Amino acid sequence: YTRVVWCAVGPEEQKKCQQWSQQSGQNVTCATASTTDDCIVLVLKGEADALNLDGGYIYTAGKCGLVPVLAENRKSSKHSSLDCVLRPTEGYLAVAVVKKANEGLTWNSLKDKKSCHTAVDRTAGWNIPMGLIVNQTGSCAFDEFFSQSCAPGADPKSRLCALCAGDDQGLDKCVPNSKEKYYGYTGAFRCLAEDVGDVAFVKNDTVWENTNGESTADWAKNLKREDFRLLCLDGTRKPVTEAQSCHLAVAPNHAVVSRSDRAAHVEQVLLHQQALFGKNGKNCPDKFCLFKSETKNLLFNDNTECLAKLGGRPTYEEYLGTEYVTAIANLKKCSLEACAF
Numbered sequence: 001y002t003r004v005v006w007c008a009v010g011p012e013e014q015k016k017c018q019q020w021s022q023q024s025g026q027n028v029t030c031a032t033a034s035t036t037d038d039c040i041v042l043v044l045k046g047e048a049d050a051l052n053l054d055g056g057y058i059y060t061a062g063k064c065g066l067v068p069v070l071a072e073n074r075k076s077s078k079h080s081s082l083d084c085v086l087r088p089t090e091g092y093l094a095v096a097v098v099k100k101a102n103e104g105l106t107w108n109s110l111k112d113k114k115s116c117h118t119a120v121d122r123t124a125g126w127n128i129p130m131g132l133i134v135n136q137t138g139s140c141a142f143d144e145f146f147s148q149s150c151a152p153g154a155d156p157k158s159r160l161c162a163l164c165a166g167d168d169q170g171l172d173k174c175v176p177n178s179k180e181k182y183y184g185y186t187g188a189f190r191c192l193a194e195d196v197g198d199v200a201f202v203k204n205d206t207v208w209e210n211t212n213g214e215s216t217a218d219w220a221k222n223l224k225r226e227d228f229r230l231l232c233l234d235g236t237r238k239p240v241t242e243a244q245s246c247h248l249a250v251a252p253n254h255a256v257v258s259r260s261d262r263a264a265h266v267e268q269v270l271l272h273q274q275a276l277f278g279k280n281g282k283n284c285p286d287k288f289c290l291f292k293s294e295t296k297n298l299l300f301n302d303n304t305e306c307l308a309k310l311g312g313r314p315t316y317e318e319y320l321g322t323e324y325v326t327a328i329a330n331l332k333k334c335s336l337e338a339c340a341f
């Protein structure tokens with residue numbers, strides 16, 4: 001009744017959800033699916049209530065009638081006066097990142113290089129960079145642009161999965177969940193860091209969070225920001241300090257979605273859960289913190305300060321913005337209006 005079923009993607013998010021479920025005294029319980037699209041179907045069926053989604057998936061869910069409920073809000077130096085929950089969201093910067101040592105690699109020499117993407121259908125990892133590449137090349141053959149990639153969610157037999165590694169045992173190669181070694185923001189940046197790919201399509205924050213000792217994970221321990229460069233659309237290369245002038249787009253924040261008929265109940269529950277387990281929550285450091293998982297961004301991004309109310313009670317189209325929505329529709333015509341399930 002006043003209980004919410006969260007949808008977890010893969011086994012590691014399932015483990016975090018179970019902990020939260022326990023600590024919440026079953027105010028939250030957990031359903032699990034192997035992929036975000038499967039979680040979306042659980043929500044539509046009414047077998048789960050909610051999950052936090054990247055903007056590309058919000059577009060999928062939105063066509064099927066799911067609505068945005070609360071948004072991830074990270075820290076800002078502006079609007080600092082306003083409480084986090086009431087503060088407007090800023091959006092994150094989609095960037096293309098290379099190694100400084102890979103000299104003369106620019107935006108205009110990316111063809112036939114090796115790429116690292118968060119997952120198919122995601123904003124920074126896929127929709128933004130592939131949308132630009134389609135427009136620029138006047139071709140829908142974006143599966144032939146890079147020599148080899150890791151793009152979780154593509155055909156495992158294809159060149160788009162050639163660089164993906166699967167799990168400890170090499171199983172689940174290219175699955176779009178955190179079992180895949182090079183999945184997600186952190187995974188795609190790891191793919192670059194280890195020189196599997198020439199370029200990673202991630203967000204600005206990912207680079208900062210996994211360099212200069214911010215991570216402590218074995219692969220990230222010795223990474224230095226100066227060893228990296230951003231690719232700008234004008235063919236230039238900049239330091240990672242210059243993302244405000246060298247990004248591919250600004251992305252809408254990840255946001256919790258639910259069925260419209262459940263939105264109000266999901267919202268009320270989540271606001272109480274974050275008071276307990278959020279950033280300064282009564283129980284966070286002590287028992288459980290919702291927004292931590294050791295750099296793994298499980299359920300929510302680890303840099304989330306709070307979940308924020310939306311305001312102007314936006315539809316999914318208003319939330320994503322007309323800019324981004326037309327980007328996706330145009331790219332989507334390479335792969336006609338309805339729910340995809």
Ligand SMILES: *[C@@H]1O[C@H](CO)[C@@H](O[C@@H]2O[C@H](CO)[C@@H](O[C@@H]3O[C@H](CO)[C@@H](O[C@@H]4O[C@H](CO)[C@@H](O[C@H]5O[C@H](CO)[C@@H](O[C@@H]6O[C@H](CO)[C@@H](O)[C@H](O)[C@@H]6O)[C@H](O)[C@@H]5O)[C@H](O)[C@@H]4O)[C@H](O)[C@@H]3O)[C@H](O)[C@H]2NC(C)=O)[C@H](O)[C@H]1NC(C)=O
Nearest residue numbers: 075076077078080093204205206208209214242243244303
């Ligand atoms: C790319 O991604 C990066 C990773 O997310 C991100 O870097 C991150 O930036 C944030 C800031 O947005 C940093 O948070 C900050 O961390 C410091 C610890 O070093 C904290 O310590 C202080 O916190 C204070 C309270 O909020 C803060 O006071 C604030 O209020 C004063 C009012 O007097 C004001 O001062 C002014 O600042 C203006 C804007 O910068 C400046 O122009 C003006 O001259 C004036 O001095 C500010 O509004 C100020 O915020 C203190 O200043 C301290 O910061 C604090 O929690 C703070 O929020 C993250 O540490 C940092 N992450 C990492 C890992 O480095 C980049 O910003 C992203 N880049 C782009 C382009 O988006």
Ligand SMILES: *[C@@H]1O[C@H](CO)[C@@H](O[C@@H]2O[C@H](CO)[C@@H](O[C@@H]3O[C@H](CO[C@@H]4O[C@H](CO)[C@@H](O)[C@H](O)[C@@H]4O)[C@@H](O[C@H]4O[C@H](CO)[C@@H](O)[C@H](O)[C@@H]4O)[C@H](O)[C@@H]3O)[C@H](O)[C@H]2NC(C)=O)[C@H](O)[C@H]1NC(C)=O
Nearest residue numbers: 127128129130131132133134135322323324326327328330
């Ligand atoms: C890949 O390429 C495709 C194809 O080019 C791109 O899709 C186009 O994206 C454009 C930008 O989103 C979009 O441009 C249109 O621009 C006009 C004018 O821009 C306006 O700016 C105003 C700010 O002062 C703002 O108030 C307006 O809302 C608008 O943003 C817009 O107006 C049109 O519609 C009006 C209908 O009432 C009409 O009167 C007017 O004459 C215009 O036709 C419009 O809303 C839009 O922004 C263009 O529509 C897109 N083209 C297609 C085919 O859909 C992709 O974005 C590219 N992909 C990537 C990743 O970049």
Ligand SMILES: *[C@@H]1O[C@H](CO)[C@@H](O[C@@H]2O[C@H](CO)[C@@H](O)[C@H](O)[C@H]2NC(C)=O)[C@H](O)[C@H]1NC(C)=O
Nearest residue numbers: 002003022023024025026027028269272273276
């Ligand atoms: C589980 O949910 C119930 C219902 O919201 C919570 O009980 C409320 O707790 C608040 C403040 O913590 C009290 O002031 C109210 O009187 C309670 N409301 C009702 C209707 O019982 C409970 O706190 C939740 N538990 C956890 C651990 O999240």
Ligand SMILES: OC[C@H]1O[C@@H](OC[C@H]2O[C@H](O)[C@H](O)[C@@H](O)[C@@H]2O)[C@H](O)[C@@H](O)[C@H]1O
Nearest residue numbers: 090091251252253318319320321322323
């Ligand atoms: O792209 C402009 C767009 O803005 C819409 O709402 C704001 C929206 O804009 C970005 O996507 C931002 O990063 C998001 O966090 C934010 O939700 C607007 O309603 C829409 O019509 C359009 O103009």
Ligand SMILES: [Fe+3]
Nearest residue numbers: 054055123124
């Ligand atoms: Fe994203």
Ligand SMILES: [Zn+2]
Nearest residue numbers: 247248249250
């Ligand atoms: Zn910009």
Ligand SMILES: [Zn+2]
Nearest residue numbers: 312314315318
């Ligand atoms: Zn509206």
